[PDB]
Write a protein that binds this ligand. Structure first.
Ligand code: CDL
Lengths: 63, 171
């Protein structure tokens, strides 16, 4: 292989791996903040569906 | 928290319908016939406000219209009504079915002297509409502001940037 080929192939490898390492650190920080705050699409533990509530008039008024 | 507000004892004084349950049960069909409007304004206010403190005055109208219901019995047909609720009052389950001739005497004297038609089978269980002037409660549960929902997903789905990014797996 030419020194140009090895050199530029090395630069492409280094770009891909630096992007992956920065993305791994960002993945760690995103998971930390989403577990802390719960305002993202991850760690959305379920609550009760409010469509299960009967909103009809009941037998007694005070409810 | 706060102090729960309660009305005074003068706000709760009304002339009570001081008659027995067999007396109420004897005249109950003509009561539901003739005392329709204030009773239904009260029960509409009672299921809508969900608060009896906001339903006192309408309730007083109930206790205003019930007494005038019984005075109008007492002025005209006291004896057939008395003969009827006594027979209702004998039964331990208070059967209407044991008391049909006294019911017929009371209904005859009421239709003659007051023009009242007894409700049929299926009438007093109707859902009727009520025209009141009081406004609709905009928050009957006194609920505070609901929390804002989480942001939904938008944007077109792109591939994963250089795959799994799991240690050395390039896909
Ligand atoms: C126009 C449309 C049509 C076009 C058609 C074009 C193609 C025509 C030809 C069709 C055939 C295609 C063949 C598959 C594509 C090339 C695969 C390849 O070379 O991957 C390179 C891959 C990484 O090299 P690369 O330079 O990064 O990528 C070059 C290519 O672009 C490779 O692509 P990549 O960069 O995208 O690589 C992705 C990624 C690259 O990998 C990574 O990023 C790293 C992760 C790899 C896994 C590491 C696991 C380590 C722990 C387990 C070790 C197990 C024990 C070792 C094996 C013992 C025996 C089983 O892959 C993986 O992570 C998947 C796992 C590895 C699978 C490799 C394919 C295996 C097929 C044959 C299986 C036979 C055994 C193979 C060896 C098994 C062990 C791997 O090499 C290895 O991981 C080393 C293993 C050797 C590769 C397998 C070669 C396949 C042919 C073997 C023939 C001889 C068989 C002899 C008998 C059986 C053995 C006893």
């Amino acid at each position: 292989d030419a020194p140009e080929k090895n050199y530029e192939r090395t630069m492409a490898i280094l770009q891909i791996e630096s992007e992956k390492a920065e993305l791994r650190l960002k993945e760690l920080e995103v998971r930390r903040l989403m577990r802390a705050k719960g305002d993202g699409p991850w760690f959305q533990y379920p609550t009760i569906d409010k469509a299960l509530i009967d909103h009809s008039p009941k037998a007694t008024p005070d409810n | 928290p706060g102090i729960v507000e309660l009305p005074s004892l003068e706000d709760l004084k009304v002339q009570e319908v001081k008659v027995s349950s067999s007396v109420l049960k004897a005249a109950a069909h003509h009561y539901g016939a003739q005392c329709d409007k204030p009773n239904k304004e009260f029960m509409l206010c009672r299921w809508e406000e969900k608060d009896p403190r906001r339903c006192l005055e309408e309730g007083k109208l109930v206790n205003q219209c019930a007494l005038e219901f019984f005075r109008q019995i007492k002025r005209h047909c006291a004896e057939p009504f008395t003969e009827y609720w006594t027979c209702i009052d004998y039964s331990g389950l208070q059967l209407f079915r044991r008391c049909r001739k006294e019911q017929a005497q009371f209904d005859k004297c009421v239709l003659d002297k007051l023009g009242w038609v007894r409700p049929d089978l299926g009438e007093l269980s109707k859902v009727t509409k009520v025209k009141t002037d009081r406004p609709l409660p905009e928050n009957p549960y006194h609920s505070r502001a609901r929390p804002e929902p989480n942001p939904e997903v938008e944007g077109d789905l792109k591939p994963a940037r250089h795959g799994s990014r799991l240690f050395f797996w390039t896909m």
